[PDB]
From a paper:
Using the local reconstruction method, we then obtained the structures of the connector complex and the portal of mature T5 at resolutions of 4.8 and 3.2 Å, respectively. The connector complex comprises two dodecameric portal protein pb7 and adaptor protein p144, and a hexameric tail terminator protein p142. We also built an atomic model of T5 terminator protein p142, including all 161 amino acid residues. The tail terminator comprises six copies of protein p142. Each p142 contains two α-helices and a β-barrel structure facing the lumen of the tube, which are homologous to the terminator proteins of other phages, such as Lambda (gpU) and SPP1 (gp17). As observed for the T5 adaptor, substantial conformational changes occur in the C-terminus between two adjacent p142 monomers, which primarily mediate the structural symmetry mismatch between the six-fold symmetric tail terminator and the three-fold symmetric TTP. Furthermore, the contact interface between the DNA and TMP was observed within the lumen of the adaptor-terminator channel. In contrast, in the T5 connector, DNA may interact with multiple regions to prevent its release, including the negative electrostatic potential inside the connector channel and the presence of TMP in the tail tube, as previously proposed for phage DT57C. The pairwise interfaces between the protein components of the T5 connector complex and the TTP are complementary in terms of electrostatic potential energy. In the mature state, the negative electrostatic potential inside the connector channel and TMP collectively prevent the release of DNA.
Author numbering:
A (entry chain C), C (entry chain A), E (entry chain E): 1 to 161
B (entry chain B), D (entry chain F), F (entry chain D): 1 to 159
Write the structure that this text describes.
């Protein structure tokens, strides 16, 4: 069950593939290559136009058929040095992230079975909750927080002991 | 979608063009020219009669046709020095700003399409939430908080 | 709209005029002249039997006819030195304040039309909320916190562009 | 209206008169004389068996005939030293106070009209809420909180 | 009314008599003699396997027949000192306390009428709420908090002035 | 009643026995030996495939036949020490722990009667609530919080 790290990896891979070096229309920040989940915080992060994917808490409920409903959360932060205008650039980055989340397809999985092979699976639904930004201080830099939720269905490894 | 800073720019342009040096009746602050969002806080801003717009969190809901609804928030701050009575000037500014927000039409809007041109759009509705007031301390200056919410439809639909 | 400072000025004028030098019956503080809103805090205020009104937050709701309902709140404090006793004399003050607020008529307005003349208006209702009291410390002095709410109808400057 | 200080004074007079040197049955603290509201806190109060009555926030509601309903609050504090047990003496004082509040009639009242005479009145009903006490520290003395509510009708009506 | 320390003393006497030096089945701590309410806190308490009962707040509601329903709370604490295992011994003691409270009879009373004699009474019900356990720190010692509630009927000393 | 420490022993024994050096399929942590409750905190624990089980507050309700219902809470913490990804190893551990909690039967139980013998019993149902994750700081190590609830009936009835 869980699949949390696999979900994060699929998310960052989807952002990278669908955002980089293609389709000037629709999506436009042209991240050459960057986005990841292993390296974050602030210190380090020597480049700009970088966006980070965090890991958050989850919630769970039990349905009376062995099916599992699991709610998962992913905080997303965006950084941009100045260029034209902190507000404009942060809003443009968050808009591109949002459209990549929404308009194209369902989320994909690359789970690894116990000491076996990878069996791809899908993700039921995706919802983007409130998205906030930083304040005036730390003037030349800027932040953009994104709160997104994922609802996956774990494999029913029940009723099969 | 998103489309926040353009909401801010549209509101700033509307307040600036609607308040400046025209219509002596109805509107009474006569800002020569001023209102912006790039520069705020308190430091700098060497004039008074200065009103500022902030940008804050917005929340969204998913209607079952691919349609989007998003409620956005803007804090408004007003400063004034003392020509006569600080409370009177503050309420004067707040009344004028509320009038300009409410009475005239929907907001004009200036989206910027990917690597293309600007296609004008609208803003659904305007709502004025609580109006706070500053305190006695920092005597010669004064503040007047305004809470306003915006609800726009983002010009895009899901699969 | 608003009319907030006009409301405060009208209420303080009502208190001062209706409370001073007249009607020994039903009213007993006989304030020579004092009640105001511009000067408060504690420092200054060299006299006593002084009473001050503050300015507080407001709340607004929109009715589907262009009519506006705005709730306005006014915190009022009373300062009084000694004499007979702090408790009874402060409560005598606040009892006079309550009776002058409730008993006699609705409010009056002296609002200002944009670059024009003053057109008087009325205020719908007054409701008096909790009335707190100070504590033992600062012994020779005492406070009396009284909170009042005002429900006015702003001029319908809508449907007329 | 308001009238709360006279409510407190009447309650103090009632406890003093009903508790002192009379009726060995029912009431057992035999307070010779003490109970007041002018002097409290802890400092001073050199004797013991003292009990104090405070003054607190009140709330009001408007019925549609000009009638007024106002709920009031009185914190009550009891102190005891150590003849035998601090807990026992505290509960004995608390039980006697609750009995005197509950069993006997409505409260008497002594309003003073504006520059006139004293016209006695009544008090509608008595309600006593949670009863808490002190902790281990400050060992030789003891405390016992009493929370009571008062609901009076103000002898006046609106327009 | 009240009768609070009557409840506390009856409870502690019940624990003592029903728990000490008898019935090696069912009840298993063999507290030789100890349990009390006057002495607590931590400092002092030189023995061990000691249990202390506190006094807490109460709550009261009024029924329209002169009957009073009063809720009273009693926090209970236990202390133990190594021997086998802290967790085991603490839950050993708390299981004994819980079964003594629950399985055997209703509470008794030794209340005192004004300057008279003792007329025993009863207590309607007992409920035992959440039971917390202490943490690793202060290693050789350990706590296990018990929160119980009682619901007695105060004597209807109303309608009889 | 109560019975918490034996619940903890049953949980630790079950995880240890279902976890060690058997069934390469399904279960992939191969913990040689670790899980316990006597030693925890962080200090000590010089190995870091370790998993710890805590003890928490429980709540009870009274059904009207003398039957008792008790909901118990168990915080579970997992540590790990690199070798590839901290996040990946933590999620693998959490998935394996959730699997072992859910898939196999009700919990076995080993109550000890007063000065008697051990009579095995059962545990009604297992529920796993929210699962938290650690933070960036303290980089080379990792945390993985698990919160589970236990609902056992006490093998005794009231009068």
């Amino acid at each position: 069950m869980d699949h949390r790290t696999s979900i994060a990896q699929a998310m960052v891979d989807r952002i990278s593939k669908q955002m980089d070096g293609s389709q000037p229309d629709e999506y436009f920040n042209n991240l050459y290559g960057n986005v990841s989940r292993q390296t974050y915080k602030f210190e380090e992060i020597r480049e700009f136009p970088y966006v980070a994917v965090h890991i958050g808490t989850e919630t769970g409920q039990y349905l009376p058929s062995g099916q599992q409903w699991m709610f998962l959360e992913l905080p997303i932060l965006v950084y941009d040095k100045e260029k034209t205008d902190i507000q404009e650039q942060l809003e443009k980055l968050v808009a591109d992230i949002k459209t990549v989340i929404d308009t194209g397809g369902n989320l994909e999985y690359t789970v690894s079975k116990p000491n076996g092979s990878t069996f791809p699976c899908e993700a039921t639904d995706m919802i983007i909750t409130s998205v906030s930004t930083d304040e005036g201080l730390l003037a030349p830099y800027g932040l953009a927080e994104i709160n997104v939720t994922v609802r996956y269905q774990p494999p029913r490894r029940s009723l099969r002991r």
